[PDB]
Design a protein around this nucleic acid. Structure first.
Ligand SMILES: [Zn+2]
Lengths: 67, 149, 107, 50, 49, 307, 148, 49, 8, 189, 98, 63
RNA sequence: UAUGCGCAUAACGCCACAGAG
């Protein structure tokens, strides 16, 4: 839904790296290079951001007040 | 003395049945003085033995020449002199079978004696005039040392 | 409130006593087992955790002669504390050596 | 079973501590049964073919 | 549902606190178990034992 | 052989490899796996930190619902010094100046009135549509404002994305931070990970030359095998074997699996401590050694209280 | 794996496996003298299982004598081609034949034929000689030993 | 290495004609009713077992 | 993965 | 469950300090017992773990469509070359240590990234306990269901298997004292 | 064999005979439930009608739970596969007659 | 599987509805997973699974 | 009979689907 605060396996803070990851991928990096530029060295950290499906932007199209 | 057997052996073959347990080689040896032959499992990490090695094999009932006290309890703290100070590879195991051939003539010049050193097995076969001190459920010490010739 | 239970055997010898250390796990248990097995007057030592639902360890010490098995437990605790004090001194001295060599090599 | 009789011939002292009636007054009186088996073996020696 | 446990014996079962504070046994009161039952009465129906 | 303290103090040394903020690689030489694993386990689960425990919500009109948002907020590292606080007692719903911290998060998303210009990105259409960690405001209770300078009590990272809003939606809540060890809950753990590995020793049992040296250089991690042109021909040598990851790829090369020997140097550890940011990692290792000293002192005081 | 020929333990490893199999033994844990005395004191894995057995047979009882086979056949060990030695029957000294003498496991691996749900093995013979409580203790303590 | 007849179908007194070629002492059958009507009930019991 | 700065 | 038919009840929430850490500094978050493989032969779970580890390491997403790998170009050869290119082992194993002992485990432990699924069958919807309660208004036996807080059956095969024990007062317990012990009045004449 | 073990013939016989006496069924034992549950429980590990063709020269019978039901529950006069099985004699005249 | 069922939680009035909180896209999936756009409704999480006999609690299908 | 505080409220089957082992 929303980016997890910590990695599940080790407790590395990964929640502050989602917008940086999207800005690196829009700047035409490879996903492996974009995960290197964030310092995600263990693949436990690296699947937390690689495989994240961000359902909150789809879930906020139904935003109620529309005002 | 509490020496049950003493001889100089010579490794004639290594693992003939081809089973190759890790850290363990089976040595089929053959004597020099007697008609004895040996089959012996040794630890070859801590004490490696090659083909054609000549070693001196002693089997004792105790490690102390000043009376066979025969404790069986293991103190690492005992710095008193032992038989094991003159040897290189020392084990300790129980004799689990002895057998031979007899037809109303006891101990007819063949007497196997199977000793297990906590799982590392050993038979010592030959003329029964040298295999007297062995009996089943007895505790023995193997004490072998490579002779440098 | 009591963290330590000493459970002697059925014999009143006090040479084979199980120490129950409450609120404890493999950290102190394995480090103490290492430091008590260095004692020459210890016949047997091991620890185990009783159940995952509980938070305590059983620790057995068996001594050889006339010393009770409270003396190797206390000596193993003091020796582990002295180990950790020396590791603390070495670590802090090395970190201070790193911070002085680094702050002067860029200037 | 006859294969397990060597297990029973070994471990003999451990089993006898569990069976306290080798010497008891009421049991260990095998007279009737051993006489009956001796009678059966005597018949079978006199009659090899049934 | 059952789960495995090795650190109980073979003749044992692991009863949760969900069931242990709900399954009761009608123990009659004798003079040689009245301290145990008295502590059990003081603990009550939601504190084990 | 007894425990010789002098032999330990001769053979023990710590070598620091790299230390910056929130990472520390060092070595412990001549210490056993029992004590090294004790230090690793203390760093994982027994060095205490401050973390959010109770979340008092007043209004939460977002779609990140309430019990999810509470867990969300508990997983945020709070940059406090945990050594200045205490454990809150059992049953204190109201914590004092000694043992608690307060953070107020109160964010309302409204539509950007001007400068929208019929665009599409949310950064222009809305204001406060993403709730970050800079929105958490510290509420000093008691005399904590005089004890701590301004900007000291804060979260470690501002830009951890807490939630995400739309106009009309509001998050209004209040957080209480308590002290605990990571054995209790993983939110209290001060390290990203702390671990070790023994140092590998790669030796060459036979001189390796030519194209076999290039195969040997490629069957290992980049850096351990320096293949060099001494005569013009190439020979291989081990150079900094610390880089090897034990992929053990040399054991698939049939010819070259007889010329090397991969083992490990016994009692030579390489620690790596990665702090989340609550304390510096050298301070975490110092406190992790003092925790084990405190365990030993705990049971020595029990023995002296029995006697 | 542990009762295979060639599985050695130092003193610390021996005592930790022995105590972690015997989770709370009342009374003194009695130990075995090591299999190898020089160069280094090393215990085999069979001595770990044997110490475990001797410490759970009841105190007024004599430990059991047993001789059976294992589920792992003797040809499962063979790597090369066997050279036939004339005066040597190979299965006289083989890890198929299990031999237990006064509690000590002298030979053979301990797999499903012993302590599994298979007859005439170690725990069935403990059921027949000793009670069923002793078989429960053997199945409990071996489980903790092997998981340790 | 003996030789054995096997018939798909049952007539027990039909094979009594051929007592010089067949070992009728060891005659066997699946039908417990045929054995119960030819050899009695204590033979049909062993056939069931 | 690096040579240690602090010498032995 | 994994995506291969390997279902499983959580037995234990094991601490992170007691979990076997790899040489990369990484614990697992799920331990799988290797004895779920031989009788079930889900080899695709091994390939999924090697493939998911390669996908995480290189930053990729691998194709797991069936029938795209032949015997000439095997799946394990492909994902082993991927893991070799990432500097890991060809066979998917790593050098794990013991979190309880500190020592490096002698075996070489197969670890990867498997995509797990959480099934909706929870123990919170399955446990039940009945001490006393409502009874059926015809027979005065307990009622059925856990939402009505009712009793469980001690049916016919349980009756049979408890007759085979020889415990007759335990059937008398379960089937007379704990269902319906009524006291009727008869004329003895 | 060496190292005799202080055991005699008569005390070994007494050991085995007392063990045979103690291995009897105790009075009370529901042996009918045990026999019923010992026919019934292995029958769950018996499949249904595996259909072995086994060539033409051999025979096939009814397997599994249908044959077990024929024996026990039905006691039928007409089973699906009736059979007889008689050995022949080793006489040469018998082998030329069979 | 407790997955991510739908996007309209307040508009849906049905008796039980099982929601996974943070589901992840599988890193290793077939191409039909992307043809049918199954990342709109993902039903699982990637886990670092180690195949080891370590604890005594994972024999006979437990985990 | 259950809950709540002697008092107040609630006191079920039959089909059909779906599922667990
Ligand atoms: Zn991570």
């Amino acid at each position: 839904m929303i980016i997890p605060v910590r990695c599940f396996t080790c407790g590395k803070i990964v929640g502050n790296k989602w917008e940086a990851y999207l800005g690196l991928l829009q700047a035409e990096y490879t996903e492996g290079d974009a995960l290197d530029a964030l310092g995600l060295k263990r693949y436990c950290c690296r699947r937390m951001l690689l495989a994240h499906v961000d359902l909150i932007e789809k879930l906020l199209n139904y935003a109620p007040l529309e005002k | 003395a509490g020496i049950l057997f003493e001889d100089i052996f010579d490794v004639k073959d290594i693992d003939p049945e081809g089973k190759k347990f890790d850290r363990v080689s089976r040595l089929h040896c053959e004597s020099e003085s007697f008609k004895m032959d040996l089959i012996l499992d040794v630890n070859i990490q801590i004490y490696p033995v090659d083909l054609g090695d000549k070693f001196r094999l002693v089997i004792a009932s105790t490690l102390y020449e000043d009376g066979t006290l025969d404790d069986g309890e293991y103190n690492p703290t005992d710095d008193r002199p032992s038989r094991a100070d003159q040897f290189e590879y020392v084990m300790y195991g129980k004799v689990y079978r002895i057998e031979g051939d007899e037809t109303s003539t006891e101990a007819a010049t063949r007497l196997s004696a199977y000793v297990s050193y906590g799982g590392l097995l050993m038979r010592l076969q030959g003329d029964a005039n040298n295999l007297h001190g062995f009996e089943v459920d007895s505790r023995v010490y193997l004490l072998m040392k490579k002779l440098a010739f | 409130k009591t963290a330590l239970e000493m459970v002697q055997a059925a014999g009143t010898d006090r040479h084979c006593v199980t120490f129950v250390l409450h609120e404890e796990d493999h950290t102190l248990g394995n480090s103490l087992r290492y430091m008590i097995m260095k004692n020459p007057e210890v016949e047997f030592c091991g620890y185990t955790t009783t159940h995952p639902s509980e938070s305590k360890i059983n620790l057995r010490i068996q001594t050889r002669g006339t010393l009770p098995a409270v003396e190797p437990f206390q000596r193993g605790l003091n020796e582990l504390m002295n180990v950790c004090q020396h590791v603390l001194d070495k670590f802090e001295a090395s970190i201070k050596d790193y911070k002085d060599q680094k702050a002067s090599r860029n200037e | 079973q006859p294969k397990q009789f060597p297990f029973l011939a070994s471990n003999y002292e451990v089993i006898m501590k569990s069976q306290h009636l080798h010497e008891v007054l009421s049991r260990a009186d095998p007279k009737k049964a051993l006489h009956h088996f001796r009678a059966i073996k005597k018949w079978q020696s006199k009659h090899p073919n049934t | 549902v059952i789960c495995p446990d090795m650190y109980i014996n073979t003749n044992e079962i692991g009863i949760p606190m969900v069931f242990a504070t709900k399954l009761t046994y009608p123990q009659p009161v004798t003079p040689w178990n009245v301290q145990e039952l008295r502590q059990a009465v003081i603990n009550g129906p939601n504190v084990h034992p | 052989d007894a425990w010789d303290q002098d032999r330990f103090e001769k053979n023990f040394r710590v070598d620091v490899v790299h230390m910056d903020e929130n990472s520390l690689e060092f070595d412990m030489v001549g210490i056993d796996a029992a004590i090294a694993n004790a230090f690793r386990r203390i760093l994982l689960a027994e060095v205490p930190t401050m973390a959010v425990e109770k979340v008092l919500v007043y209004n939460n009109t977002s779609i990140v619902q309430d019990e999810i948002l509470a867990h969300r907020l508990g997983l945020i590292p709070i940059h406090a010094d945990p050594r200045l606080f205490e454990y809150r007692n059992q049953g204190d719903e109201e914590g004092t100046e000694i043992d608690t911290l307060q953070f107020r998060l109160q964010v309302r998303c409204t539509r950007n009135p001007h400068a929208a210009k019929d665009s599409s990105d949310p950064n222009e259409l809305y204001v406060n549509h993403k709730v970050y960690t800079r929105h958490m405001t510290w509420i000093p209770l008691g005399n904590q404002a005089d004890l701590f300078p301004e900007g000291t009590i804060r979260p470690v990272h501002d830009d951890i994305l807490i939630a995400q809003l739309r106009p009309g939606q509001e998050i209004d809540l209040l957080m209480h931070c308590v002290k605990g060890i990571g054995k209790d809950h993983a939110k209290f753990s001060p390290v990203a990970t702390a671990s070790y590995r023994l140092l590998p020793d790669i030796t060459l049992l036979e001189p390796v030359e030519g194209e076999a040296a290039e195969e040997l250089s490629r069957c290992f991690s980049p850096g351990v095998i320096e293949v060099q042109e001494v005569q013009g021909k190439k020979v291989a040598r081990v150079a900094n074997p610390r880089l090897d990851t034990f992929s053990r790829e040399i054991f698939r090369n049939e010819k070259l699996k007889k010329v090397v020997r991969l083992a490990r140097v016994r009692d030579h550890y390489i620690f790596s401590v990665e702090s989340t940011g609550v304390l510096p990692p050298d301070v975490l290792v110092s406190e992790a050694i003092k925790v084990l000293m405190g365990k030993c002192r705990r049971f020595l005081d029990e023995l002296d209280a029995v006697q | 794996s542990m009762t295979t020929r060639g599985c050695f333990f130092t003193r610390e490893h021996y005592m930790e496996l022995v105590y972690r199999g015997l989770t709370d033994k009342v009374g003194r844990v009695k130990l075995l003298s090591p299999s190898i005395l020089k160069p280094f004191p090393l215990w085999t894995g069979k001595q770990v299982v044997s110490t475990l057995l001797i410490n759970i047979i009841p105190e007024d009882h004599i430990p059991l004598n047993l001789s059976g086979k294992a589920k792992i056949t003797g040809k499962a060990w063979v790597k090369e081609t066997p050279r036939s030695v004339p005066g040597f029957n190979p299965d006289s000294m083989c890890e198929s034949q299990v031999i237990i003498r006064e509690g000590e496991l002298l030979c053979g691996v301990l797999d499903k034929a012993h302590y599994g749900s298979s007859a005439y093995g170690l725990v069935h013979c403990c059921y027949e000689i000793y009670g069923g409580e002793t078989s429960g203790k053997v199945l409990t303590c071996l489980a903790r030993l092997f998981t340790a | 290495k003996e030789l054995v007849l096997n018939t798909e179908g049952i007539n027990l007194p039909e094979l009594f004609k051929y007592a010089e070629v067949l070992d009728l002492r060891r005659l066997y059958s699946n039908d417990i009713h045929a054995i119960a009507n030819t050899y009695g009930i204590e033979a049909a019991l062993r056939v069931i077992e | 993965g690096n040579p240690p700065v602090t010498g032995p | 469950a994994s995506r291969h038919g390997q279902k499983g009840i959580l037995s234990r929430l094991w601490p992170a300090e007691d979990m076997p850490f790899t040489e990369s500094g990484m614990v697992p978050d799920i331990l799988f017992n290797p004895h779920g493989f031989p009788s079930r032969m889900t080899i695709g779970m091994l390939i999924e773990s090697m493939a998911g580890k390669s996908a995480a390491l290189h930053g990729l997403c691998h194709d797991a469509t069936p029938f795209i790998f032949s015997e000439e170009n095997s799946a394990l050869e492909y994902f082993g070359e991927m893991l070799k290119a990432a500097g890991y082992n060809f066979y998917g194993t790593e050098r794990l240590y013991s979190g309880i002992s500190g020592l490096e485990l002698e075996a070489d432990i197969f670890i990867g990234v498997v995509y797990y699924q959480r099934l909706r069958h929870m123990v919170s919807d399955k446990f039940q306990v009945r001490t006393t309660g409502a009874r059926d208004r015809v027979t005065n036996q307990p009622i059925g269901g856990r939402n009505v807080q009712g009793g469980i059956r001690f049916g016919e095969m349980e009756r049979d298997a408890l007759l085979a024990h020889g415990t007759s007062f335990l059937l008398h317990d379960r089937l007379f004292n704990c269902s319906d012990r009524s006291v009727a009045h008869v004329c003895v004449k | 064999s060496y190292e005799k073990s202080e055991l005699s013939l008569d005390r070994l016989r007494t050991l085995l005979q007392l063990k045979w006496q103690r291995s009897l069924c105790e009075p009370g034992e529901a042996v009918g439930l045990l026999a019923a549950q010992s026919i019934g429980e292995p029958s769950t590990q018996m499949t249904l009608n595996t259909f072995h063709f086994a060539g033409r020269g051999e025979m096939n019978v009814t397997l599994g739970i249908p044959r077990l039901r024929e024996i026990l529950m039905v006691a039928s006069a007409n089973i699906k596969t009736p059979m007889m099985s008689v050995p022949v004699l080793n006489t040469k005249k018998a082998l030329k007659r069979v | 599987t407790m997955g991510f069922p739908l996007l309209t939680y307040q508009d849906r009035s049905d008796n039980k509805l099982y929601r996974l909180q943070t589901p992840q896209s599988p890193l290793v999936r077939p191409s039909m997973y992307d043809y049918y756009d199954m990342d709109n409704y993902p039903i699982g999480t990637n886990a670092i699974v180690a195949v080891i006999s370590y604890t005594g609690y994972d024999m006979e299908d437990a985990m």
